């Protein structure tokens, strides 16, 4: 259904900060140039209306992951990011988790089913990095190592608890 037409036009709309574009979905669109995927990331940096960005199954690679990481350090709007079924490696994934040190607005990240498998050292490091982020509530990924898997689940439950705590101590103290 969507195609290179929509891809160029939607990108313009992002750059223009169109208030009516709250969701960008590129899922399953083939033959998007890597630099076009990068441009999406670059445009989204200062976009104030896009809440969800989904690029699943676009052949996005680490260059795309790096571009997205940069954008994540700046963007205060996107709450849900879908990277499933792409060519992102553990490097691209670490860059994103390092970016999340600087991001308190993204609550859902999913990278299921990458064609290049993450690696244990990367899973161990994701868990270490996630400790420093208190706003991510959902991580779409299935861990190979039982240890990082447990730690990440506990961290996500923690973050869920931290968000209720913040809201409650706002409501309580605002009387
Ligand atoms: Ni879809
Ligand atoms: Ni493929
Ligand atoms: Ni590349
Ligand atoms: Ni390169
Ligand atoms: Ni690949
Ligand atoms: Ni997975
Ligand atoms: Ni999975
Ligand atoms: Ni292939
Ligand atoms: Ni499971």
Author numbering: 177 to 229, 365 to 486
From the paper:
Tropomodulins (Tmods) constitute a conserved family of four isoforms that work in conjunction with one of several tropomyosin (TM) isoforms to cap the pointed end of actin filaments in cytoskeletal structures characterized by their uniform distribution of the lengths of actin filaments. Leiomodins (Lmods) are related to Tmods, and constitute a subfamily of three isoforms: Lmod1, expressed preferentially in differentiated smooth muscle cells; and Lmod2 and Lmod3, expressed more abundantly in skeletal and cardiac muscles. Lmods are distinguished from Tmods by the presence of a C-terminal extension, featuring a proline-rich region and a WH2 domain. We show that ABS2, and not the C-terminal extension, is the main factor distinguishing Lmods and Tmods as filament nucleators and pointed-end-capping proteins, respectively.
To test this hypothesis we designed Tmod–Lmod ABS2 hybrid constructs aimed at combining their respective pointed-end-capping and nucleating activities. The first two constructs (TL1ABS2 and TL2ABS2) consisted of Tmod1 residues 164–229 and Lmod1 residues 365–486 (or Lmod2 residues 246–367). Strikingly, at 25 nM both TL1ABS2 and TL2ABS2 had nucleation activities comparable to that of their full-length Lmod counterparts, albeit at higher concentrations the full-length proteins displayed higher activities. Importantly, both TL1ABS2 and TL2ABS2 had much higher activity than the wild-type ABS2 domains from which they originate. The structure of TL1ABS2, the strongest of the hybrid nucleators, was determined at 2.1 Å resolution, and shows Tmod1 residues Glu-177 to Phe-229 followed by Lmod1 residues Ala-365 to Gln-486. The structure superimposes well with those of Tmod1ABS2 (r.m.s.d. of 0.41 Å for 125 equivalent Cα atoms) and Lmod1ABS2 (r.m.s.d. of 0.27 Å for 124 equivalent Cα atoms). What is more, the side chains in the hydrophobic core of TL1ABS2 have the same rotamer orientations as in the two parent structures. Therefore, the strong nucleation activity of TL1ABS2 is solely due to its amino-acid composition, and not to changes in the overall structure. Curiously, the hybrid constructs combining the capping N terminus of Tmod1's ABS2 with the added affinity of Lmod's ABS2 were better nucleators than those of the wild-type proteins. The ABS2 of Lmod has the required affinity to recruit two or more subunits for nucleation, but by adding a pointed-end-binding element, we have limited the ability of this domain to bind along the length of the filament when in isolation, that is, the hybrid constructs emphasize nucleation at the expense of filament side-binding. These constructs constitute the smallest single-domain protein with strong nucleation activity identified thus far.
